Amino acid sequence: GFGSKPLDSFGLNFF
């Protein structure tokens, strides 16, 4: 997603 977490479809996961 986009945010401070590990992997997501858009890189690093949202909050």
Coordinates of C-alpha atoms in Angstrom, one line a residue:
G1 CA 0.0 0.0 0.0
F2 CA 1.9 3.2 0.9
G3 CA 3.0 3.6 4.5
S4 CA 5.2 2.3 7.3
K5 CA 4.8 -1.6 7.3
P6 CA 6.3 -4.5 5.4
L7 CA 5.3 -5.7 1.9
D8 CA 2.2 -4.5 -0.1
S9 CA 1.1 -4.4 -3.7
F10 CA 2.5 -0.8 -3.9
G11 CA 5.6 -1.6 -1.9
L12 CA 5.2 -1.0 1.9
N13 CA 1.8 -1.2 3.6
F14 CA -0.6 1.7 4.5
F15 CA -2.1 2.7 7.9

